[PDB]
């Protein structure tokens with residue numbers, strides 16, 4: 001119903017409107033509730049003593065951020081109902097010689113890199129020091145968004161589409177012991193602890209500044225755009241593994257199970273499992289995404305890997321990735337299932 005668009009597809013006036021709505025949220029005092037919630041969650045351990053918390057390093061990571069974004073989008077809309085939360089596809093940016101040159105970091109959107117001369121404070125765009133006040137872990141105004149693109153050793157680059165495919169392939173939502181150690185965990189892989197930092201965590205440390213330190217990261221509006229991407233990735237995974245569901249269903253830590261409340265709210269994973277049902281959809285879920293159907297199966301095809309589709313002579317397809325050249329990511333118009341088909345089997 002409400003459509004979350006890729007930052008690349010936003011109109012100038014869309015971008016201006018998102019920025020303005022955020023500045024209003026900041027002025028009204030609403031925005032700072034989201035910083036506080038995020039910090040509170042991060043220090044609420046499940047159970048006390050573990051390094052699992054309500055929002056990170058555990059199974060709730062995904063449903064938690066979904067609910068936070070849904071909440072934030074609603075606040076946005078209460079200001080200007082036309083506004084939805086866009087998403088930052090960093091895998092597209094990763095394709096550039098210099099991802100810093102992404103239009104996302106323009107003075108009309110998120111503004112630029114930290115200024116080394118000025119101690120890495122941001123001095124372009126609407127969130128530059130002097131237009132936007134930040135707070136520390138304690139709540140004490142620390143005045144000034146900072147960023148430092150790609151500066152750290154562990155995270156010089158943004159994750160790639162291949163990095164995302166690797167993750168979209170994992171069959172299990174999450175696995176014991178439901179934390180940063182989890183293996184064959186779509187959730188832990190997306191969070192980015194498997195050979196970390198990857199994907200979600202990598203983006204954090206790539207941006208640097210407040211974004212590089214989880215308790216302060218929402219001081220940067222881009223945190224929302226980043227997380228919209230993460231949620232989008234999760235939604236695709238849900239469409240793909242439509243047979244799979246969230247785990248743990250039971251007997252995980254309290255706060256982590258399908259039906260536990262996620263501190264700091266009464267929202268359960270279950271409550272936010274079906275995003276469509278929460279009133280919003282990603283743009284790649286309508287019609288004519290980034291291309292047209294190179295569809296029509298020329299011949300019957302039987303799958304020869306786990307990530308391939310089977311199909312009959314006749315099935316039309318919505319092609320979704322072009323990268324590999326020979327095997328391209330598609331979606332069946334009959335079955336609505338998603339996986340790989342070989343190019344040479346379909347003609348437009």
Ligand SMILES: [Zn+2]
Nearest residue numbers: 038055056214
């Ligand atoms: Zn977080």
Ligand SMILES: [Zn+2]
Nearest residue numbers: 200204217227
């Ligand atoms: Zn995050």
